[PDB]
Amino acid sequence: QLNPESADLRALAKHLYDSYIKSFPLTKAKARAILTGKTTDKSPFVIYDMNSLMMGEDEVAIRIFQGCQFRSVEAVQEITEYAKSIPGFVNLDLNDQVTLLKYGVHEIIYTMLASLMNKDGVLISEGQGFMTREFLKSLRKPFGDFMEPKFEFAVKFNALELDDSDLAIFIAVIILSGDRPGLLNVKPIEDIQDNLLQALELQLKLNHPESSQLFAKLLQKMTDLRQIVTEHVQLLQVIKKTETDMSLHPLLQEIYKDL
Amino acid sequence: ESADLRALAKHLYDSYIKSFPLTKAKARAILTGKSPFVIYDMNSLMMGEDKIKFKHITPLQEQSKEVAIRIFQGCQFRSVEAVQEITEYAKSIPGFVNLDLNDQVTLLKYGVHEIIYTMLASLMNKDGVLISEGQGFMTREFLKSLRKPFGDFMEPKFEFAVKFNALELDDSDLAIFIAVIILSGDRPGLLNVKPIEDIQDNLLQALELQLKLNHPESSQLFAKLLQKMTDLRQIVTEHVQLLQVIKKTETSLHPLLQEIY
Ligand SMILES: COc1ccc2[nH]cc(CC(=O)O)c2c1
Ligand SMILES: COc1ccc2[nH]cc(CC(=O)O)c2c1
Ligand SMILES: COc1ccc2[nH]cc(CC(=O)O)c2c1
Ligand SMILES: COc1ccc2[nH]cc(CC(=O)O)c2c1
Ligand SMILES: COc1ccc2[nH]cc(CC(=O)O)c2c1
Numbered sequence: 001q002l003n004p005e006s007a008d009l010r011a012l013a014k015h016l017y018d019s020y021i022k023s024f025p026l027t028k029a030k031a032r033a034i035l036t037g038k039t040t041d042k043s044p045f046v047i048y049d050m051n052s053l054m055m056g057e058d059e060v061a062i063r064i065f066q067g068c069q070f071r072s073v074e075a076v077q078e079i080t081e082y083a084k085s086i087p088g089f090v091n092l093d094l095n096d097q098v099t100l101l102k103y104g105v106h107e108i109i110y111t112m113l114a115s116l117m118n119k120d121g122v123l124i125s126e127g128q129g130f131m132t133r134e135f136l137k138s139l140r141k142p143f144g145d146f147m148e149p150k151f152e153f154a155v156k157f158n159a160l161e162l163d164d165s166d167l168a169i170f171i172a173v174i175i176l177s178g179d180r181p182g183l184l185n186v187k188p189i190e191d192i193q194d195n196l197l198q199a200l201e202l203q204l205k206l207n208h209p210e211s212s213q214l215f216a217k218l219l220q221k222m223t224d225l226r227q228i229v230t231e232h233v234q235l236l237q238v239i240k241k242t243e244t245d246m247s248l249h250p251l252l253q254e255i256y257k258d259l
Numbered sequence: 260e261s262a263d264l265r266a267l268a269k270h271l272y273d274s275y276i277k278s279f280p281l282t283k284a285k286a287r288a289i290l291t292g293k294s295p296f297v298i299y300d301m302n303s304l305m306m307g308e309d310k311i312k313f314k315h316i317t318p319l320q321e322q323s324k325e326v327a328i329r330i331f332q333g334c335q336f337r338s339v340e341a342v343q344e345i346t347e348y349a350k351s352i353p354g355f356v357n358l359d360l361n362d363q364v365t366l367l368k369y370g371v372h373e374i375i376y377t378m379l380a381s382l383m384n385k386d387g388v389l390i391s392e393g394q395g396f397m398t399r400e401f402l403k404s405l406r407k408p409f410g411d412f413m414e415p416k417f418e419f420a421v422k423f424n425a426l427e428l429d430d431s432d433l434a435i436f437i438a439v440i441i442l443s444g445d446r447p448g449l450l451n452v453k454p455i456e457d458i459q460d461n462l463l464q465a466l467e468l469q470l471k472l473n474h475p476e477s478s479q480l481f482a483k484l485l486q487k488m489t490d491l492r493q494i495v496t497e498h499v500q501l502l503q504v505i506k507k508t509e510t511s512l513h514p515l516l517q518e519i520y
Contacts, residue, residue, distance in 0.1 A: 156445070179422055179490065197479040216463045219485040223492045224445075230493065 009199045012087070013169055016199075019085035020168035023078050026127050027164045028115035034127045035118055044123060048132040056129060061140035062246065064131075065239075067124070068146070073249050075109050076101075079171075086172045088192045096189065099182050102255055104175035106232070107225040111171060114154035115164075122147070142239055149231055153224050160218060166207060169200040170218060174225075233259065264465045267353065268435055271465070274351030275434035278344050281393050283381035283430045290384055295396040301326065304401075313391040319511045327405040328510055330397075331412065335520050341378075342371050345437075352438045354458045359450050366455065370441045372495040373488075377437065380420035388413070408504055419494050423487050426480065431473060435466040436484060 021027065034042045047056045080101060083089055089097065116123040121132035136147045162170070176193040178186050201215045208214050233256055239246065248256075276282060289295060296311050298304045304326065308317060316333030323329045346367055350356055355363065382389040387398040402413045428436070442459035444452045467481045474480050 177486075179486065194479050197482040201479075201482070213460050213463045216467070216481070216485055219482055220488060222486060223489040226489050226493060227496070230496070 006202065009202050012195070012199045013165065013203045016086070016172055017165045017168040019082055020164060020171070023082040023085070024112070025078075026116065026123070028112075028162075028167065029164055031116045031123055031127060034123060035130075042127075044128055044130040046121075046130045046132065047124075048121075048135045052135075059140065061143040062243070064136075064139065065143060065146070065246070069249055069252065071124075072109060073251050075112070076105050076251060076255070079105055079108050079175075082171070083175055086175065086192070087195075088188070089176070092188060093184050096183050096185060099180050100175050100177065100189070103180045103259070104177065105255060106229045107174050107222070108171050110150060110153060110225050110228050111157075111167065111174070113150055114157045115167070117151060117154040117158070119151065119155050122151075142235070142242060145235060146232070149228055153228055156224070157221055160211075160214065160221070161208075162218070163207070166200075166203060169196060169203055172196050173200055174222070229259075261468060264461075264468045267461065267465045268431065268469050271352065271434040271438055272431050274348060275430060275437070278348035278351070279378070280344075281382065281389075283428075283433060286382050286389055286393055289389055289393050290396075295389060295391075295394055297396045297398065298390075299398045299401050304330075304397075307395055311391045311395045313394065319513075319516060322513055322516070323510065325509075327407065327409040328508065330402075330405065331409055331505070332510070338375060339520050341375055342367075345371055345374050348437065349441050352441065352458070352462075354454065355441070358454050362449050362451060362455065365446050365448050366441050366443065369446045370443065372498065373440050373491050374437055376416055376419065376491060376494055376498075377423070377440065378433070379416060380423045381433070383417060383420045384424070385417075385421055388417075407508065408501055412498075412501055412505075415494055415497060419487075419490055422490065426477075426484060426487070427474075428480075428484065429473070432466070432469055432484075435462060435469050438462045439466055440488070 030042075033039065034044060037043060045052075045056060047053050050060065053060055083097075083101060083104075089100075092100075113122070116127070119133065121130050121136075123129065124131050133147065133151050137144045139146075173193060173196045176189055176196055178189040178193055183189060200218075204211070204215045204218070236248070236256070240248065296307050298307045308314065313333070316329070316336045319332075323332055349363075349367060355366075358366075379388070382393075383399075385399070387396055387401075389395070390397050399413075399417050402410065402417075404410050405412070439459055439462045442455050442462060444456045444459065449455065466484075470477065470480045470484070
């Protein structure tokens, strides 16, 4: 009914969900509660235009871009924090630790960004605001392209109906890849991941008894994340050339450096 | 229904061997232990052209004569040939032929490249790829050293086989994996996705079991194989990028050839 070996895997799933909760202020649970009128105090101010943008704080394409930027640098701090709590991560070769974060951080951001989205928009400012998908797509030419592919991923991905206990493990599976470019010692990274994969596969069947092959359907979504990161940079470098007076946080530049 | 899954696996494996000439097993016996003609440079290549008799990509007179361009030309003629091999195999997968015809064309349209490099990995090793029906062996260092963008074309695939082969999968596993790849419901333009996912669902179960029984020792192999699907996509997109970049070259009269390929 539950081997002694299974228990450890549950103990791990738990330890992880816990850190996830302590490292991320806005969980999917809260995001979903805010988004589905599950309240009168949790409901966000909606921004779908210029006047709404005005009321919001009470050109546009660029203030928003900068907002996303600092929110990311923020997230990178949250993820790193989370990373330190993954059994064995800190015990790894220091360099390898940096590589993992480098290549893992944006795939993790997109996964979690989805928790804050629905097909009409996304929560912003800790869930106090909600920016619509169409208003975002109308931003000045190049900028009107930053959010769409994310929105596109989010709809396919939210379809899996995963929750924070599921995500806490999947996020750790992402960081502990091993097929990342430039790893010195792969064997150790792979042993940790082999472990994380076990815990996620169990966590998924217990938590989604009816969902057939969710474990695999989930692991496949990983190709979608890479394509998102890949595309974002191509689009990010374009912005870098048109807008010469625009900057990209040093931390964020170190991530994208020779990715 | 484990007994139903092994039936699907055996069926796919049987169909797979009937559709593909050079298999992982067959190819792995070559690299290890009548060796293939080894091509490691300009002259050794010029030599193989008439020895390997892979003079199928050769008949076309005055259409390149440029070493680097001729090698690329042969990889296409061979890939077009492979696509027929893959299409036939796809038609073995239970339920495939019953999908909307438009959807069958689409699944194949977007799965071929991915499937090609997956099987190409069965033919290569750290040092080079086995070519011409296993007749020859084209070194990896010889390829990474071709002119214009050619000397960077194959290199990425070598990086991928190295990692993919690390999984030590065999034809039994590969047959099922190929089937999964084809039945991908995220292909753009699909009219009726439900049937496709239903099929890929039974395929994944079949694949999982297959790996649990075939490689008991391999922990979470199923998971690791699905993860390689992420690099395979990057490889295909990048590859496609080259094809539009390579469009900056001169590259039986072409009209018709150009049409077939
Ligand atoms: C305005 O929409 C955005 C834009 C960039 C972002 N980076 C990170 C997040 C939140 C999260 O990952 O939970 C985010 C939200
Ligand atoms: C996570 O989604 C987004 C969407 C638009 C963005 N613009 C700038 C960033 C910061 C980064 O490149 O990480 C960003 C992030
Ligand atoms: C197996 O990789 C290759 C090599 C040469 C090629 N020429 C044309 C295509 C298909 C396409 O039109 O994208 C192609 C694929
Ligand atoms: C494995 O990919 C390759 C690389 C170089 C090549 N040169 C000629 C061919 C066609 C053939 O095998 O007849 C070929 C295929
Ligand atoms: C049997 O599977 C395949 C699929 C695509 C291919 N492209 C080039 C080759 C080498 C060759 O066999 O000449 C090849 C082999």
